[PDB]
Design a protein around this ligand. Structure first.
Ligand SMILES: [Cu+2]
Length: 153
């Protein structure tokens, strides 16, 4: 509901703290997250999980979560069942959070806590993904930056 904590640990150091306050009453989620990462950009936050492992999400790879924004658009439309924002890392791995007007976006449709985020300093696009299947699923680097995300309160 009111706050969330994200904890990511990868092969490359990726660390950030994303906190999102949503409620089923419908309202823009006030969310803040900073990411530190290897040198790259980042575009789109498209998480899609039902919980796997905070060291790398196997389920988060090729699994589309349609409840999100139907495809998972970054601004959200319904219940982006993943973290919603746009973040762009610099060469020093530092991404400022774009806080978008979301509707019911708690990161996860089956639940939130335990759900592993798939983002990285990379375009983790929503509806475009990358290649046809990744377009469908909405890009995921299963272990590129993954950790259990969830509303921690
Ligand atoms: Cu992704």
């Amino acid at each position: 509901a009111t706050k969330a904590v994200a904890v990511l640990k990868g092969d490359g150091p990726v660390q950030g703290i994303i906190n999102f306050e949503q409620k089923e009453s419908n309202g823009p989620v006030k969310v803040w997250g900073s990411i530190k990462g290897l040198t790259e950009g980042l575009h789109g936050f498209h998480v899609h999980e039902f919980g796997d492992n905070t060291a790398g999400c196997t389920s988060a790879g090729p699994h589309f979560n349609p409840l999100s924004r139907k495809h998972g658009g970054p601004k959200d439309e319904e219940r982006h069942v993943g973290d919603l924002g746009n973040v762009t890392a610099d060469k020093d791995g530092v991404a400022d959070v774009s806080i978008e007007d979301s509707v019911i976006s708690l990161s996860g449709d089956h639940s939130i806590i335990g759900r592993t985020l798939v983002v990285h300093e990379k375009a983790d696009d929503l509806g475009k993904g990358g290649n046809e299947e990744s377009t469908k699923t909405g890009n995921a680097g299963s272990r590129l930056a993954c950790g259990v995300i969830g509303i921690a309160q």
